[PDB]
């Protein structure tokens, strides 16, 4: 299939009250497996499958690298504040890096930054240069290119990342490949109760889902709204969809749920005769 490895990091001037200024988190197929913050200063396991499939030297090597990342991004905050001629305020440096193992067999690589939530730089592994998204990123480009990082980064994205991703997918194939059935509730609210109807799929895994409305057994996209996919504390997902109906029309509607955990689409009504 397709597997993704993602490392996201944020360095912030204002996190704030009792919260770490620097945080790094790792993702395999969208699932959190590692964490680092500037208070603990240690890389830590977040899933059962990564722990007991890795020894102490793995976490020691990860700790050292992210401690290095932390210090660079501390400096980055100072460098960019000065370059932008900013006096105080709330500022952030964000990084996203990793790789994709596409269905085709082909490999995608990413190494990119944002300053104050706007694209700053991105590595173009095709041309072996760092692309400047803004004029303030031109001195960055010149320093980074002179630093000779392209070679090692191309190598990391096309090979080391891919190899690491294969390892992790193998350690967590059972958890990543599991199926969790959602518990579904159809509800309604306002004039006698049938203005806004809601359908909620609680606790599904994996993330892909299709939640739609049927009125007298026919698909209804009209007056429908989705809240998207939202997470639960246990790694499972939640989604809520609404449709605006005429008062007294509650019994006409059904919520259709298409998910991997369901052999056939689930059809649900607001209570029984509501």
């Amino acid at each position: 299939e397709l597997h993704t490895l993602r490392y996201i990091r944020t360095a912030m001037t204002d996190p704030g009250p009792g919260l770490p200024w620097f945080v790094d988190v790792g993702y395999v197929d969208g699932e959190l497996f590692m964490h680092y913050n500037s208070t603990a200063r240690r890389a830590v396991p977040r899933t059962e499958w990564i722990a007991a499939n890795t020894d102490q030297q793995y976490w020691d090597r990860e700790t050292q690298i992210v401690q290095g990342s932390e210090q660079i991004n501390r400096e980055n905050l100072d460098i960019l504040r000065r370059r932008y001629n900013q006096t105080g305020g709330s500022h952030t440096v964000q990084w996203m890096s990793g790789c994709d193992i596409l269905e085709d067999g082909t490999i995608r690589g990413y190494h990119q930054a944002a300053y104050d939530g706007r694209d700053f730089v991105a590595f173009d592994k095709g041309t072996m240069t760092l692309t400047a998204a803004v004029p303030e990123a031109v001195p960055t480009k010149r320093k980074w290119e002179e630093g000779g990082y392209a070679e090692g980064l191309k190598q990391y994205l096309e090979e080391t990342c891919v190899e690491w991703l294969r390892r992790y997918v193998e350690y967590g194939k059972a958890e990543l490949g599991r199926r969790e059935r959602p518990e579904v509730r159809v509800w309604g609210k306002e004039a006698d109760g049938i203005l806004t109807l809601s359908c909620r799929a609680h606790g599904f895994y994996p993330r892909p889902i299709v939640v739609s409305w049927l009125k007298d057994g026919a698909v209804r996209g009209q007056d429908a709204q989705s809240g998207g996919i939202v997470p639960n504390g246990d790694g499972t997902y939640h989604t809520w969809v609404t449709i605006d109906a005429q008062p007294g029309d509650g019994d006409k509607y059904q919520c259709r749920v298409e998910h991997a955990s369901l052999p056939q689409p689930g059809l649900y009504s607001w209570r029984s005769g509501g």
């Binding site: 793995y58 990342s69 630093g147 990082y149 690491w164």
Partner: peptide, 11 residues
């Protein structure tokens, strides 16, 4: 794993 070269985060 993270790339060993944290220097590639130099801005």
């Amino acid at each position: 794993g993270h790339a060993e070269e944290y220097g590639a985060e130099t801005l």
